[PDB]
Amino acid sequence: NKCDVVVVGGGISGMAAAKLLHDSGLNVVVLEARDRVGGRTYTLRNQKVKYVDLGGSYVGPTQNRILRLAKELGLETYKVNEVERLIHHVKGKSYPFRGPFPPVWNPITYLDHNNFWRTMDDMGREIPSDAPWKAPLAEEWDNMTMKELLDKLCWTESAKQLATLFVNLCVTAETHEVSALWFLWYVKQCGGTTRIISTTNGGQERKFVGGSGQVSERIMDLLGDRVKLERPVIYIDQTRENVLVETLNHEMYEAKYVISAIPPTLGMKIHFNPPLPMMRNQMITRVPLGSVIKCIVYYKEPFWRKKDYCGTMIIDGEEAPVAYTLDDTKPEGNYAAIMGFILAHKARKLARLTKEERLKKLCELYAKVLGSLEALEPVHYEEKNWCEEQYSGGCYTTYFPPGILTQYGRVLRQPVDRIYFAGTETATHWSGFMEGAVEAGERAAREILHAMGKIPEDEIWQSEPESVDVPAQPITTTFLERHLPSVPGLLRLI
Amino acid sequence: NKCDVVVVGGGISGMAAAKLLHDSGLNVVVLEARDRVGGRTYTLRNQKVKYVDLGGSYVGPTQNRILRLAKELGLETYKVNEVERLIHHVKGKSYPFRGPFPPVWNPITYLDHNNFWRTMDDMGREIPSDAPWKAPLAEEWDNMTMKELLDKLCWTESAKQLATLFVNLCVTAETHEVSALWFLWYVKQCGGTTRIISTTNGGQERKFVGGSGQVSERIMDLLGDRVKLERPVIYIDQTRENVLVETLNHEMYEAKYVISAIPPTLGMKIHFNPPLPMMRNQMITRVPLGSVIKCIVYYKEPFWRKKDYCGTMIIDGEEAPVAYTLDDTKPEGNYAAIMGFILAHKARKLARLTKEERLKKLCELYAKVLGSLEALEPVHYEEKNWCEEQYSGGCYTTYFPPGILTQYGRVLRQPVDRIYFAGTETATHWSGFMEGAVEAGERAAREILHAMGKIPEDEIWQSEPESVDVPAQPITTTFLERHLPSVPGLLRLIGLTTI
Ligand SMILES: *[C]C1=C([C])[C]=C2C(=[C]1)N([C][C]([O])[C]([O])[C]([O])[C]OP([O])(=O)OP([O])(=O)O[C][C]1O[C](N3[C]=NC4=C3N=[C]N=C4[N])[C]([O])[C]1[O])C1=NC(=O)[N]C(=O)C1=N2C#C[C][N][C]1[C][C]C2=C1[C]=[C][C]=[C]2
Ligand SMILES: *[C]C1=C([C])[C]=C2C(=[C]1)N([C][C]([O])[C]([O])[C]([O])[C]OP([O])(=O)OP([O])(=O)O[C][C]1O[C](N3[C]=NC4=C3N=[C]N=C4[N])[C]([O])[C]1[O])C1=NC(=O)[N]C(=O)[C@@]13=N2C3#C[C][N][C]1[C][C]C2=C1[C]=[C][C]=[C]2
């Protein structure tokens, strides 16, 4: 019935918010809509797989908040397998390689690729992480889609295809679907193009021993019976002295403050009294999530390592169900598996199939790309279609279509009276990742702390010490990369 | 507690659905979230204004369903004043004219304007009204915004600037916010560019004597206490023998079937058991409504008629709060007023102002454009900002961004078990209008009737006899209009005759 702060949602952001408030002696209640905590993280357990991450899973250098939080909960990381060669599959042939970027040999193409990533990053530097709507050319950039920008920038089909894959892989949306300004912000606020794409030395380096879902689970363990499962919030009343929150089962909670720790658009599932301010009212109808099926095929052995492949595959073209894969074998070398994503529109198309039909396409595919009959002999299969999730809306995160970010961006984490906003969407570093989920939950927690005079203003946003277990090497560019002309730069010079 | 059909929402669509079901002896309940019926229609009454439509209001030729429905309810129409000259205000000057299109003299500009509207309509003909994702070039047209298309098509700033206002005016969104395919569909499904834009002989011709809100109010009168106000639906359970609907106040209804008659995106306010099928799950996060403030300034007289202006103004350029206006005087010639819309991003920006600050800007604006100091002397002011409405989400209707429509369009009116879908967004003729709202409610009603074996499949979609009070002239094109080259067509013809 009564407490200091009601937290709506038990994902990493909610749980992190609850923890920080509870470690300050406050009385918190987490209202979670599902019969489990974790949200967009979800670790499944059975005999066959032991455990498997079916949502959020990967963490890496510069992601210091999730690393710290998880360590404090007694969790450990291991490195994702990247010892042997990666494969780029393009126009139906596999080209093995090392390093993080696939090499390109043709001189003109080389220049077009070099200049594209470099322009991605150049544009990023003019975009403030904590207010992108304040980039100098924000309207110009917000009013075009990432496809218009690709058509403009890429003088070769090679470079344009790879850049489309990247966009698809990062935001589980089509380049036609998103704003150039939002996506350029997104990449920027994760440290730029190198940092975001890398396995070794970028966001894909590591996973958690036992499952990322143990982050939320263990916090729910720490909070005891303060966490209420199967409590979907349906009403929020801020007209009286205290905030009143009603859940679907008819329970009623009272607090001094509320934290909304759910995807922005899911605020649509709550009725408000008084009505939300006009900007936020319309903002929450204009901000959808990506579309992705996460798919994990199991094998007797990690057969690919025999051929000196690591399990990473970058797979070009429309016919391929899966554009990207990683080795999902346990650190001990057993439960051998390949993880792959079915992205954006392909997630919509391939959902019409049965589970067993998708398993077939993915093995046929992996057989082609790996050049192994062994790939046609799977022992087990798990998959998750996040588009069907009522209390997610999609995965991995929220994207902004044309025109929206500059109009409604500001509103995202603006408090509405006594409601404060967390969720990975409201983060300013690694937004859309687990890392950003911790950042935004701890910040909203400290906003309420401050509103209660417990801390000064300067302490609301707080920096994080570099992990000692997963330290970060800095991003470096060679002299030519930085200075070689673009294709039109080379034409102007000719 | 129990009935045949629960209808969520008592807007024109819900009310028309309810009426058709109840006229077949079925037991219906309308669950309306607000303390009033009419939703996006809303007639305000007071001494100062008598009445005023603050939401939907206009009807005209080819809109036979609303015309019939309202007539049966004992309502009458009158013609919006269009007797004297219209004004096109561009680059700070007013250029009076007659006949629904502002004329253009410059022959190069004239060619670009001609070819733009004509191309709008040409592209229309390739898009099916009832399945626009089936256009031959659907993906290509759906993956680009309306502003990419205008950059491509318009060889003059003159034509591009007017075409932007047209889009802003029709869909209360920016050109860069919407799909080229969706917008082309939208215009097409209203009869094409002429039909849509016209006051005389197009959708803006008339209003209802007394207010459009009387349509829903009178249906509520006819239905008695079946209409339940302040019942926002929060829950729908379809796991058992009957459908269970729970409202926010904790009431519970049981029916054999449900009709959702609320903006598509507003289905997000309902919790579903079992979960929605995946396409519809995500469809509803992907389809937002426009942004408009509807504004009516009142004067002692309709002073503009004295100067031989009818009250219509097409006002170009970024400094103007209002891009379009219409004479709102009562048909008796009293309660003299001007109606104007603040569109799209202008509605966001000018909401930060106070009610009295916006009245100033509009008056100053009207004064420049009418060249009248009397414009600066208002007697009364009423405005509605529909962006702030929780149970609308915007006005006038729902728009589809780049890539959505071909991916999620099919889903819009697909039943989910025993839930059937109405509301104007689901209509295939005049979608976005009060007309579309009637079309889609009567169709959903008949869907349920058919599911109950009461009517054959062929009776689900039904045509409508032409109104005799508001008959429709057909749309005609001159020989040059149809055949003159475009700017690039004229360049290729100059190129061919030398090189
Ligand atoms: C889904 C997904 C997947 C499949 C994958 C991924 C992901 C996802 N990610 C993301 C994550 O997961 C996220 O971000 C997080 O988790 C977030 O969180 P938050 O914010 O907290 O939220 P959530 O979780 O959702 O939760 C919330 C809650 O709430 C609730 N609710 C609702 N509503 C309601 C409620 N309650 C009450 N009431 C009401 N009404 C719900 O239920 C929930 O629970 C990720 N992340 C990271 O970090 N990592 C990873 O890995 C991930 N994943 C992935 C990623 C990928 N990456 C990639 C690879 C390759 C590449 C990339 C990128 C870039 C480049 C390259
Ligand atoms: C808002 C507006 C404005 C300002 C204007 C306009 C409009 C609007 N419009 C549109 C109309 O209004 C619409 O469409 C109708 O009304 C529809 O309806 P429906 O379908 O039925 O829907 P609604 O209304 O919304 O209703 C529903 C209901 O539901 C409810 N809910 C929610 N949620 C819930 C509920 N319940 C329970 N539960 C829950 N959960 C609500 O509350 C409601 O009630 C229009 N239309 C027409 O026809 N006309 C007119 O006039 C109108 N307006 C305008 C127009 C304009 N036009 C223009 C001028 C010039 C031009 C144009 C266009 C083009 C060219 C040129």
Of A270, B15, B399, the closest CA to residue A258 belongs to: A270
Domain over B106-197 is classified CATH 1.10.405.10: yes
d(CA A218, CA A212) in angstroms, rounded, equals 11
- Residue type at B167 in one-letter notation: V
Per the CB < 8 A criterion, the answer to whether B53 and B434 are in contact is: no
Atom of ligand 2 nearest to the CA of B40: 24
Which one of A143, A147, A177 has the shortest CB-CB distance to B176?
A143
Per the CB < 8 A criterion, the answer to whether B103 and B481 are in contact is: no
d(CA A185, CA A174) in angstroms, rounded, equals 16
How were these coordinates obtained?
Answer: X-ray
Residue found under tokens 């979960």: B275
Q: Encode chain B in three state secondary structure.
A: CECCEEEECCCHHHHHHHHHHHCCCCCEEEECCCCCCCCCCCEEEECCCEEEECCCCCECCCCHHHHHHHHHCCCCEEECCCCCEEEEEECCEEEEECCCCCCCCCHHHHHHHHHHHHHHHHHHCCCCCCCHHHCCCHHHHHCCEHHHHHHHHCCCHHHHHHHHHHHHHHHCCCHHHCEHHHHHHHHHCCCCHHHHHCCCCCCCCEEECCCCCHHHHHHHHHHHHHEECCCCEEEEECCCCCEEEEECCCCEEEECEEEECCCHHHHHHCEEECCCCHHHHHHCCCCCECCEEEEEEECCCCHHHCCCEEEEEEECCCCCCCCEEEECCCCCCCCCEEEEEEECHHHHHHCCCCHHHHHHHHHHHHHHHHCCHHHHCCCEEEEEEHHHCCCCCCCCCECCCCCHHHHHHHHHHCCECCEEECCHHHCCCCCCCHHHHHHHHHHHHHHHHHHCCCCCHHHCCCCCCCCCCCCCCCCCCCHHHHHCCCHHHHHHHHHHCCC
Across the interface, whether the CB atoms of A388 and B286 are under 8 A apart is answered: no
CA angle B362, B364, B367 (to 5 degrees): 105
d(CA B493, CA A125) in angstroms, rounded, equals 47
CA angle B394, B397, B401 (to 5 degrees): 95
Per the CB < 8 A criterion, the answer to whether A441 and A12 are in contact is: yes
Cβ burial of A394 (10 Å; 0-12, 13-18, 19+) is: buried
Per the CB < 8 A criterion, the answer to whether A226 and A211 are in contact is: no
Residue found under tokens 């997104």: A186
All residues at 6 or more sequence positions from A103 whose CB lies less than 8 Å from its CB, including other chains: A97
Total residue count of chain B as it appears in this document: 499
- Helix B12-22 and helix B434-451, axial crossing angle in degrees, nearest 10: 40
Residues of chain A with CATH 3.50.50.60: 1-39+61-76+209-287+401-461
CA-nearest residue for atom 33, ligand 1, is A391
- Torsion region of A317: left, alpha or beta (phi above 0 gives left; psi -120 to 50 gives alpha): left
d(CA B121, CA B185) in angstroms, rounded, equals 10
User: Hey, what's the torsion of the CAs at B319, B322, B325, B330, to 10 degrees?
Assistant: -130
CA angle A371, A376, A378 (to 5 degrees): 125
Token duo for residue B148:
């990419």
Residue found under tokens 């009522």: A390
Across the interface, whether the CB atoms of B271 and A385 are under 8 A apart is answered: no
Q: Is the dihedral of CA B27, B30, B35, B39 positive or negative?
A: negative
Query: SS3 of A79, please?
Result: strand
CB contacts, 8 Å: A149 with chain B: none
Per the CB < 8 A criterion, the answer to whether B397 and B98 are in contact is: no
What stretch of H or E contains A234? strand A233-237
Min Cα distance B356 → chain A (Å) is: 19
CA-nearest residue for atom 65, ligand 2, is B197
d(CA A62, CA A435) in angstroms, rounded, equals 9
Token duo for residue B266:
């507003």
Token duo for residue A144:
């075009």
Which residues have CB under 6 Å of ligand 2? B 8-14, 31-34, 39-41, 55-59, 169-170, 196-197, 204, 232-233, 261-263, 266, 269-270, 292, 294, 324, 386, 391-392, 395-397, 423-424, 432-435, 437
Per the CB < 8 A criterion, the answer to whether B464 and B90 are in contact is: no
Residue found under tokens 């967004």: B425
Query: SS3 of A95, please?
Result: strand
Q: Does residue A57 have its Cβ closer than 6 Å to ligand 1?
A: yes
Q: Encode A180-209 in three state secondary structure.
A: HHHHHHHHHCCCCHHHHHCCCCCCCCEEEC
Cβ burial of B108 (10 Å; 0-12, 13-18, 19+) is: middle
> What architecture does CATH give domain B1-39+61-76+209-287+401-461?
3-Layer(bba) Sandwich (3.50)
Query: Which of the 8 DSSP states describes residue A373?
Result: G
Q: Return the bridge partners of A255, or none.
A: A243
Per the CB < 8 A criterion, the answer to whether A393 and A312 are in contact is: no
d(CA A427, CA A412) in angstroms, rounded, equals 10
- Residue type at A20 in one-letter notation: L
Residue found under tokens 């304007």: B113
Per the CB < 8 A criterion, the answer to whether A288 and A178 are in contact is: no
Token duo for residue A230:
């199967």
Of B78, B60, B57, B85, the closest CA to residue B333 belongs to: B78
Cβ burial of A351 (10 Å; 0-12, 13-18, 19+) is: middle
Residue found under tokens 């290729």: B492
Distance of CA A431 to the CA centre of its chain: 7
Name the residue of chain B whose CA is nearest to A142's CA: B176
All residues at 6 or more sequence positions from A402 whose CB lies less than 8 Å from its CB, including other chains: A142, A143, A144, A145, A178, A179, B145, B176, B177, B401, B402
CA-nearest residue for atom 7, ligand 2, is B56
Residues of chain B with CATH 1.10.405.10: 106-197
Token duo for residue B129:
């009204």
d(CA B52, CA B48) in angstroms, rounded, equals 10
| CATH number for the domain running over A40-60+77-105+198-208+288-400 | 3.90.660.10
Cβ contacts below 8 Å, chain A against chain B, sum to 126
Atom of ligand 2 nearest to the CA of B38: 44
Query: Which of the 8 DSSP states describes residue A145?
Result: B
Of A344, A362, A209, A200, the closest CA to residue A297 belongs to: A362
HSE-CB for B345 with a 13 A CA cutoff: 18
Residue found under tokens 């080229």: B180
d(CA B440, CA B442) in angstroms, rounded, equals 6
Atom of ligand 1 nearest to the CA of A270: 40
d(CA B439, CA B20) in angstroms, rounded, equals 12
Residues of chain B with CATH 3.90.660.10: 40-60+77-105+198-208+288-400
HSE-CB for A47 with a 13 A CA cutoff: 1
